[PDB]
Amino acid sequence: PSSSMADFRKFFAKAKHIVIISGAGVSAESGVPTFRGAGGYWRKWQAQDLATPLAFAHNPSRVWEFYHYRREVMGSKEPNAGHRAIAECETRLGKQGRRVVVITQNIDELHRKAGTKNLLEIHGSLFKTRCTSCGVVAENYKSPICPALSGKGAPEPGTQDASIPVEKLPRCEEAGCGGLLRPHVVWFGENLDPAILEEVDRELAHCDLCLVVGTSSVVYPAAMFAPQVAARGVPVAEFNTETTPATNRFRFHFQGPCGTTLPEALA
Protein backbone atom coordinates (compact mmCIF):
# COMPACT_ATOMS: atom_id res chain seq x y z
CA PRO A 1 0.00 0.00 0.00
CA SER A 2 0.90 3.66 -0.29
CA SER A 3 2.82 5.43 2.48
CA SER A 4 1.73 8.96 1.54
CA MET A 5 0.24 10.84 4.46
CA ALA A 6 -0.42 13.70 2.03
CA ASP A 7 -2.78 11.60 -0.15
CA PHE A 8 -4.62 10.21 2.86
CA ARG A 9 -5.29 13.76 4.06
CA LYS A 10 -6.94 14.63 0.74
CA PHE A 11 -9.55 11.88 1.25
CA PHE A 12 -10.02 12.87 4.92
CA ALA A 13 -10.75 16.51 3.99
CA LYS A 14 -13.86 15.45 2.06
CA ALA A 15 -15.03 12.37 3.98
CA LYS A 16 -18.49 12.72 5.52
CA HIS A 17 -18.76 9.36 7.31
CA ILE A 18 -15.57 7.84 8.75
CA VAL A 19 -15.42 4.37 10.31
CA ILE A 20 -12.47 3.77 12.65
CA ILE A 21 -11.82 0.12 13.56
CA SER A 22 -9.54 -0.12 16.63
CA GLY A 23 -7.65 -3.12 18.00
CA ALA A 24 -5.40 -4.14 20.88
CA GLY A 25 -2.56 -1.91 19.72
CA VAL A 26 -4.53 1.16 20.79
CA SER A 27 -4.97 -0.40 24.24
CA ALA A 28 -1.37 -1.61 24.63
CA GLU A 29 -0.19 1.96 24.00
CA SER A 30 -1.98 2.85 27.25
CA GLY A 31 -0.22 -0.01 29.06
CA VAL A 32 -3.43 -2.04 29.32
CA PRO A 33 -2.42 -5.72 29.72
CA THR A 34 -4.29 -7.84 27.19
CA PHE A 35 -2.50 -11.15 27.79
CA ARG A 36 -2.38 -11.99 24.10
CA GLY A 37 1.23 -11.46 23.06
CA ALA A 38 3.98 -14.01 23.40
CA GLY A 39 5.13 -13.74 27.00
CA GLY A 40 2.05 -11.91 28.32
CA TYR A 41 0.63 -14.08 31.10
CA TRP A 42 -1.62 -13.78 34.18
CA ARG A 43 -0.22 -16.35 36.64
CA LYS A 44 0.20 -19.37 34.37
CA TRP A 45 -2.38 -18.39 31.74
CA GLN A 46 -3.07 -16.06 28.83
CA ALA A 47 -6.31 -14.71 27.43
CA GLN A 48 -6.39 -17.59 24.91
CA ASP A 49 -6.82 -19.84 27.97
CA LEU A 50 -9.08 -17.83 30.26
CA ALA A 51 -11.24 -15.75 27.90
CA THR A 52 -12.97 -18.94 26.86
CA PRO A 53 -16.24 -20.80 27.52
CA LEU A 54 -14.10 -23.75 28.67
CA ALA A 55 -12.41 -21.70 31.38
CA PHE A 56 -15.72 -20.36 32.71
CA ALA A 57 -17.43 -23.79 32.74
CA HIS A 58 -14.41 -25.33 34.42
CA ASN A 59 -13.43 -22.69 37.01
CA PRO A 60 -15.63 -19.58 37.03
CA SER A 61 -13.83 -18.30 40.13
CA ARG A 62 -10.50 -18.20 38.25
CA VAL A 63 -12.12 -16.43 35.29
CA TRP A 64 -13.65 -13.86 37.67
CA GLU A 65 -10.30 -13.37 39.43
CA PHE A 66 -8.71 -12.64 36.02
CA TYR A 67 -11.42 -10.17 34.97
CA HIS A 68 -11.42 -8.60 38.43
CA TYR A 69 -7.69 -7.96 38.12
CA ARG A 70 -8.28 -6.43 34.71
CA ARG A 71 -11.07 -4.17 36.02
CA GLU A 72 -8.97 -3.02 38.96
CA VAL A 73 -5.92 -2.17 36.85
CA MET A 74 -8.02 0.16 34.67
CA GLY A 75 -7.98 2.69 37.52
CA SER A 76 -4.29 3.32 36.71
CA LYS A 77 -4.68 3.42 32.91
CA GLU A 78 -5.44 6.49 30.83
CA PRO A 79 -6.38 7.10 27.19
CA ASN A 80 -3.41 7.74 24.94
CA ALA A 81 -2.82 10.20 22.09
CA GLY A 82 -4.63 7.90 19.67
CA HIS A 83 -7.80 7.77 21.82
CA ARG A 84 -7.66 11.52 22.28
CA ALA A 85 -7.17 12.30 18.58
CA ILE A 86 -10.04 9.95 17.76
CA ALA A 87 -12.37 11.53 20.29
CA GLU A 88 -11.47 15.11 19.28
CA CYS A 89 -11.95 14.22 15.62
CA GLU A 90 -15.49 12.95 16.27
CA THR A 91 -16.39 16.09 18.21
CA ARG A 92 -14.93 18.51 15.62
CA LEU A 93 -16.43 16.73 12.63
CA GLY A 94 -19.80 16.31 14.33
CA LYS A 95 -20.13 20.11 14.47
CA GLN A 96 -19.67 20.12 10.67
CA GLY A 97 -22.34 17.48 10.06
CA ARG A 98 -19.78 14.73 9.54
CA ARG A 99 -19.97 11.36 11.27
CA VAL A 100 -17.16 9.44 12.96
CA VAL A 101 -17.85 6.02 14.45
CA VAL A 102 -15.44 3.84 16.35
CA ILE A 103 -15.87 0.07 16.09
CA THR A 104 -13.55 -1.38 18.72
CA GLN A 105 -12.45 -4.85 19.53
CA ASN A 106 -11.11 -3.57 22.87
CA ILE A 107 -12.98 -4.12 26.11
CA ASP A 108 -11.31 -1.51 28.34
CA GLU A 109 -13.62 1.46 27.55
CA LEU A 110 -10.68 3.85 27.09
CA HIS A 111 -12.39 5.22 23.95
CA ARG A 112 -15.39 6.21 26.11
CA LYS A 113 -13.06 7.60 28.78
CA ALA A 114 -11.46 9.86 26.13
CA GLY A 115 -14.88 11.14 25.08
CA THR A 116 -15.92 9.06 22.11
CA LYS A 117 -19.71 8.96 21.88
CA ASN A 118 -20.27 6.89 18.73
CA LEU A 119 -18.74 3.61 19.93
CA LEU A 120 -19.58 0.00 18.99
CA GLU A 121 -17.85 -2.43 21.39
CA ILE A 122 -17.94 -5.64 19.37
CA HIS A 123 -16.34 -7.82 22.08
CA GLY A 124 -18.22 -6.28 25.05
CA SER A 125 -16.70 -4.60 28.08
CA LEU A 126 -14.81 -5.35 31.32
CA PHE A 127 -17.43 -3.08 32.91
CA LYS A 128 -20.56 -5.02 31.92
CA THR A 129 -21.96 -8.26 33.32
CA ARG A 130 -24.19 -10.83 31.65
CA CYS A 131 -26.46 -13.21 33.57
CA THR A 132 -25.92 -16.87 32.60
CA SER A 133 -29.58 -17.63 33.59
CA CYS A 134 -31.71 -14.75 32.30
CA GLY A 135 -29.24 -13.14 29.85
CA VAL A 136 -29.69 -9.57 31.18
CA VAL A 137 -26.73 -7.28 30.51
CA ALA A 138 -25.83 -4.59 33.09
CA GLU A 139 -23.17 -1.96 33.57
CA ASN A 140 -20.98 -2.62 36.58
CA TYR A 141 -18.09 -0.47 37.78
CA LYS A 142 -17.95 -1.51 41.46
CA SER A 143 -14.49 -2.10 43.02
CA PRO A 144 -14.64 -4.92 43.99
CA ILE A 145 -17.53 -6.39 41.96
CA CYS A 146 -18.41 -8.68 44.87
CA PRO A 147 -17.03 -8.87 48.38
CA ALA A 148 -15.31 -12.22 47.92
CA LEU A 149 -13.13 -10.69 45.18
CA SER A 150 -11.78 -8.01 47.54
CA GLY A 151 -8.00 -8.05 47.22
CA LYS A 152 -8.07 -11.01 44.82
CA GLY A 153 -6.74 -11.31 41.31
CA ALA A 154 -2.99 -10.82 41.84
CA PRO A 155 -1.07 -11.78 38.66
CA GLU A 156 2.22 -13.10 40.11
CA PRO A 157 2.93 -16.77 39.34
CA GLY A 158 2.47 -18.86 42.42
CA THR A 159 -0.55 -16.92 43.62
CA GLN A 160 -3.19 -19.35 44.90
CA ASP A 161 -6.61 -19.73 43.29
CA ALA A 162 -9.31 -17.90 45.27
CA SER A 163 -11.70 -20.86 44.72
CA ILE A 164 -14.70 -18.71 45.52
CA PRO A 165 -17.88 -20.79 45.73
CA VAL A 166 -20.21 -19.86 42.92
CA GLU A 167 -22.80 -18.35 45.27
CA LYS A 168 -20.17 -15.79 46.39
CA LEU A 169 -19.25 -14.86 42.80
CA PRO A 170 -21.24 -11.99 41.23
CA ARG A 171 -24.96 -12.80 41.16
CA CYS A 172 -27.86 -11.35 39.12
CA GLU A 173 -29.90 -8.76 40.99
CA GLU A 174 -32.93 -9.01 38.72
CA ALA A 175 -35.92 -9.69 40.97
CA GLY A 176 -36.30 -13.44 41.10
CA CYS A 177 -33.15 -14.51 39.26
CA GLY A 178 -29.91 -14.49 41.25
CA GLY A 179 -28.14 -16.46 38.49
CA LEU A 180 -24.39 -16.51 38.11
CA LEU A 181 -23.01 -13.49 36.27
CA ARG A 182 -20.17 -13.66 33.76
CA PRO A 183 -18.24 -10.76 32.24
CA HIS A 184 -20.15 -9.41 29.23
CA VAL A 185 -17.05 -10.06 27.08
CA VAL A 186 -17.09 -12.11 23.86
CA TRP A 187 -14.79 -15.06 24.43
CA PHE A 188 -12.83 -17.02 21.88
CA GLY A 189 -15.13 -19.31 19.99
CA GLU A 190 -18.31 -17.41 20.87
CA ASN A 191 -20.60 -15.59 18.43
CA LEU A 192 -20.74 -11.83 18.43
CA ASP A 193 -24.10 -10.20 19.13
CA PRO A 194 -26.16 -10.09 15.90
CA ALA A 195 -27.67 -6.72 16.84
CA ILE A 196 -24.20 -5.21 17.16
CA LEU A 197 -23.18 -6.83 13.89
CA GLU A 198 -26.25 -5.27 12.24
CA GLU A 199 -25.17 -1.85 13.48
CA VAL A 200 -21.61 -2.49 12.28
CA ASP A 201 -22.90 -3.53 8.85
CA ARG A 202 -24.93 -0.29 8.61
CA GLU A 203 -21.85 1.85 9.27
CA LEU A 204 -19.70 -0.16 6.90
CA ALA A 205 -22.30 0.15 4.12
CA HIS A 206 -22.56 3.95 4.42
CA CYS A 207 -19.06 5.13 5.27
CA ASP A 208 -16.92 6.94 2.74
CA LEU A 209 -13.56 6.44 4.50
CA CYS A 210 -12.31 3.69 6.81
CA LEU A 211 -9.29 3.51 9.16
CA VAL A 212 -8.02 0.26 10.77
CA VAL A 213 -5.81 1.10 13.75
CA GLY A 214 -3.72 -0.98 16.14
CA THR A 215 -4.95 -4.43 15.18
CA SER A 216 -3.21 -7.57 14.02
CA SER A 217 -6.13 -8.52 11.72
CA VAL A 218 -5.99 -12.13 12.95
CA VAL A 219 -9.20 -12.20 15.07
CA TYR A 220 -12.40 -12.77 13.15
CA PRO A 221 -15.00 -11.66 12.21
CA ALA A 222 -13.41 -8.26 13.04
CA ALA A 223 -10.51 -8.77 10.68
CA MET A 224 -13.07 -8.98 7.82
CA PHE A 225 -14.86 -5.59 8.26
CA ALA A 226 -12.32 -3.26 6.65
CA PRO A 227 -11.82 -5.72 3.81
CA GLN A 228 -15.51 -5.41 2.79
CA VAL A 229 -15.56 -1.56 2.81
CA ALA A 230 -12.87 -1.62 0.20
CA ALA A 231 -15.33 -3.47 -2.16
CA ARG A 232 -17.65 -0.49 -2.66
CA GLY A 233 -14.54 1.53 -3.63
CA VAL A 234 -14.02 3.16 -0.20
CA PRO A 235 -10.38 3.87 0.85
CA VAL A 236 -9.05 1.89 3.86
CA ALA A 237 -5.98 3.09 5.82
CA GLU A 238 -4.03 0.80 8.23
CA PHE A 239 -2.09 2.36 11.15
CA ASN A 240 -0.15 -0.44 12.89
CA THR A 241 3.36 -1.22 14.15
CA GLU A 242 3.86 -3.96 11.58
CA THR A 243 2.30 -5.31 8.42
CA THR A 244 -0.51 -7.83 8.99
CA PRO A 245 -2.00 -10.60 6.82
CA ALA A 246 -4.53 -7.97 5.64
CA THR A 247 -2.07 -5.11 4.84
CA ASN A 248 -2.03 -5.65 1.10
CA ARG A 249 -5.83 -5.26 0.97
CA PHE A 250 -5.68 -1.55 1.91
CA ARG A 251 -5.05 1.76 0.16
CA PHE A 252 -2.64 3.04 2.81
CA HIS A 253 -0.28 1.61 5.44
CA PHE A 254 1.32 3.87 8.07
CA GLN A 255 3.89 2.08 10.23
CA GLY A 256 4.35 3.16 13.79
CA PRO A 257 2.67 3.28 17.16
CA CYS A 258 -0.96 4.33 16.82
CA GLY A 259 -0.45 7.22 19.23
CA THR A 260 2.22 8.60 16.88
CA THR A 261 0.58 8.47 13.46
CA LEU A 262 -3.13 9.00 14.19
CA PRO A 263 -2.98 12.59 15.50
CA GLU A 264 -1.50 13.73 12.19
CA ALA A 265 -4.03 11.75 10.13
CA LEU A 266 -7.16 13.06 11.95
CA ALA A 267 -6.12 16.72 12.47
Binding site: H123, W187, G189, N191, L192, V219, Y220, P221
Partner: peptide, 4 residues
Protein backbone atom coordinates in the same frame (compact mmCIF):
# COMPACT_ATOMS: atom_id res chain seq x y z
CA UNK B 1 -19.68 -15.48 12.90
CA UNK B 2 -17.59 -16.41 15.90
CA UNK B 3 -14.61 -14.83 17.54
CA UNK B 4 -11.23 -16.18 16.34
Amino acid sequence: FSKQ
